[PDB]
C-alpha cells in the first residue's frame, strides 16, 4: 500500500508551482506523478493574436532566467521564415549575450541546486555575479530581466559606448569567482554523497526520453547544437564541449561547472573580435528605420508607421 | 560608415584566466598525522603526570 | 597554457595594500585570487548618461 504525499506547490525545492504527487513505500519512491499547469497562462493561444514583433516578449517570460536565448530561438525561427540575414556585428552581439545569458542561467541553476541540497552560501556568492551581469542587461536593453533586446533581424539597439571594457573587466575576475564555488563544492564529500549515482540515466534512455543538454551530455553522448548545427557566431569562436560518462547528478554538476568556463572563453573572444557595422538587418521593410531618418524621409516614415501598426 | 561605435582595442585585451585554478595546499597527510601523534603523546604525558601527583596529594590528605 | 593563472594585479578588483597585502599573500589559499570588488575610478566610469561618444554617434 503506497503512501501519497503532495510535494509542493508551497515548497522551496518545488519552486512554488510543482505539485509533485509522490507515492512512498516507507522511504522509497514507487511512483511519481508531477502535476503542472499551476503556471499555464495560455502563451501559445495568445501569440496567435499578436504580431510577430508584439509576440516577442512572450518568450522572455518562458524561461525567465534565460531571456535572451529565448528571444534568440524565436528570432531564428522568424528570420528563417523571412529569408533575411543578420549583420555580422549583430550576430556577434547575439553570441556574446547568449553566453552571458548562459552564465546567468547556470549561476541560478547551480546555486539553486546547492541551496536545495543545503549549501546556502554559493547562492549568495553567485547572486552577486548575477547582479553584475544584470547591470550589463540593463545597460543595453533597459530592463534587468525581460530585455526584449534580441529581435527578428538582429538586436533592438547598438551597444552603449563603454560596455566592452566593463564586460572585460568583469571577465578578468569571474574565473576566481568560479574557483571559490568549486572550492566549496567539487571535492566536498557531502556534496558527492548527495550527488554521486543519484538520478542515473542511461544513454539510450536519454535519447528515448527526449532529454537534451547537460541531461544528455552527462550520459556520454557528445551532442551540442552549437557544434552540430552551428547557429549565429558559434562557428567563428573556439570552445570545447564537456561530456560526462556516468549520467548522474555529479557528472551533470561537473558539466555545468565546465560550461561556465567555456562561456567565459566565448565572451572574451567576442570582446576581442566585435566588428563594426549594423546590428539589425538593413531592410526597413523588416526592422524599423533609425529615428533620424524617420523624421526626415518619407519612405522611412511610411515603413515605420506600417511596421508598428 | 561606423562612427562612435563601441569597438575593441587595436591590440586586443589581455587574456583572462578561465581554467580551473585550485592549487594544492598543505603538508603531506603523514606530516599532519605525525603532528597529531606528537600533540596527543605530549598531552598524555602531562595528563598522566598530573594524575600521579594528584594521587600523592591524596596520600597526604 | 592560455587561460591559465594570471596574477592578481592584472585583475580589475580592489585588493589590499601595505602590510595587509603581505598578510593576505601569506594567509591566502591561492594568492592570485581577486576579491570581487570593482575598482571605483575605473569601473562604469564615465557613467552611461555622460559618455562623450553620444555626441558623435551616427547610424551604422
Amino acid at each position: 500500500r503506497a503512501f501519497t504525499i503532495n510535494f509542493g506547490p508551497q515548497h522551496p525545492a518545488a519552486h512554488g508551482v510543482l505539485r509533485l504527487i509522490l507515492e512512498l513505500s516507507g522511504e522509497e519512491i514507487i511512483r511519481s506523478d508531477p502535476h503542472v499547469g499551476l503556471l499555464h497562462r495560455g502563451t501559445e493561444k495568445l501569440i496567435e493574436y499578436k504580431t510577430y514583433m508584439q509576440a516577442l516578449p512572450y518568450f522572455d517570460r518562458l524561461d525567465y532566467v534565460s531571456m535572451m536565448t529565448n528571444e534568440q530561438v524565436f528570432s531564428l525561427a522568424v528570420e528563417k521564415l523571412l529569408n533575411v540575414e543578420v549583420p555580422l556585428r549583430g550576430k556577434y552581439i547575439r553570441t556574446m549575450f547568449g553566453e552571458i545569458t548562459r552564465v546567468l542561467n547556470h549561476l541560478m541553476s547551480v546555486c539553486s541546486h546547492a541551496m536545495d541540497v543545503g549549501a546556502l552560501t554559493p547562492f549568495l556568492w553567485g547572486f552577486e555575479e548575477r547582479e553584475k551581469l544584470m547591470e550589463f542587461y540593463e545597460r543595453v536593453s533597459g530592463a534587468r530581466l525581460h530585455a526584449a533586446y534580441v529581435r527578428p533581424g538582429g538586436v533592438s539597439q547598438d551597444l552603449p559606448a563603454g560596455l566592452l571594457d566593463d564586460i572585460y573587466m568583469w571577465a578578468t575576475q569571474f574565473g576566481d569567482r568560479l574557483d571559490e564555488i568549486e572550492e566549496l563544492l567539487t571535492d566536498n564529500r557531502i556534496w558527492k554523497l548527495r550527488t554521486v549515482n543519484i538520478g542515473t540515466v542511461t544513454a539510450q534512455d536519454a535519447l528515448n526520453l527526449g532529454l537534451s543538454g547537460p541531461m544528455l551530455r552527462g550520459s556520454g553522448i557528445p551532442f551540442d547544437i552549437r557544434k552540430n548545427a552551428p547557429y549565429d557566431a558559434y562557428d567563428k569562436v573556439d570552445f570545447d564541449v564537456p561530456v560526462g560518462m556516468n549520467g548522474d547528478c555529479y557528472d551533470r554538476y561537473l558539466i555545468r561547472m565546465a560550461e561556465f568556463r567555456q562561456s567565459l572563453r566565448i565572451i572574451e573572444q567576442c570582446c576581442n573580435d566585435m566588428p563594426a557595422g549594423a546590428v539589425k538587418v538593413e531592410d526597413f521593410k523588416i526592422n524599423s528605420p533609425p529615428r533620424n531618418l524617420m523624421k526626415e524621409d518619407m519612405e522611412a516614415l511610411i515603413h515605420h508607421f506600417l511596421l508598428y501598426t | 560608415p561606423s562612427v562612435g561605435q563601441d569597438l575593441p582595442p587595436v591590440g586586443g585585451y589581455e587574456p583572462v584566466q578561465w581554467r580551473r585554478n585550485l592549487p594544492a595546499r598543505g603538508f603531506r597527510p603523514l606530516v599532519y598525522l605525525a603532528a597529531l601523534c606528537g600533540i596527543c603523546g605530549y598531552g598524555f604525558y602531562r595528563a598522566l603526570g598530573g594524575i600521579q601527583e594528584r594521587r600523592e596529594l591524596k596520600r597526604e590528605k | 597554457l592560455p587561460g591559465g593563472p594570471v596574477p592578481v594585479f592584472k585583475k580589475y578588483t580592489v585588493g589590499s595594500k601595505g602590510i595587509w597585502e603581505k598578510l593576505r599573500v601569506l594567509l591566502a589559499i591561492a594568492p592570485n585570487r581577486s576579491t570581487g570588488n570593482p575598482i571605483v575610478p575605473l569601473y562604469r566610469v564615465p557613467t552611461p548618461g555622460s559618455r562623450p561618444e553620444a555626441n558623435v554617434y551616427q547610424d551604422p
Binding site: 549583420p87 555580422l88 563603454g162 571594457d165 572585460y168 573587466m169 566588428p275 563594426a276 557595422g277 549594423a278 | 560608415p1 561606423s2 569597438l7 575593441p8 582595442p9 587595436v10 591590440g11 585585451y13 | 596574477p7 592578481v8 594585479f9 592584472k10 585583475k11 580589475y12 578588483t13 580592489v14 585588493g15 595594500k17 597585502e21 575598482i39 575605473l42 566610469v45 551604422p60
Partner: peptide, 24 residues
C-alpha cells in the same frame, strides 16, 4: 605590480573602420 597602477583600458587606442563591407 599592484592594482593601484593597473593600466587604464579606457584610454587604449580603439580600432576604427571607415566603411563596412557586407556583401548581399
Amino acid at each position: 605590480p599592484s592594482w593601484e597602477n593597473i593600466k587604464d583600458i579606457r584610454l587604449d587606442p580603439k580600432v576604427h573602420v571607415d566603411e563596412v563591407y557586407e556583401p548581399i
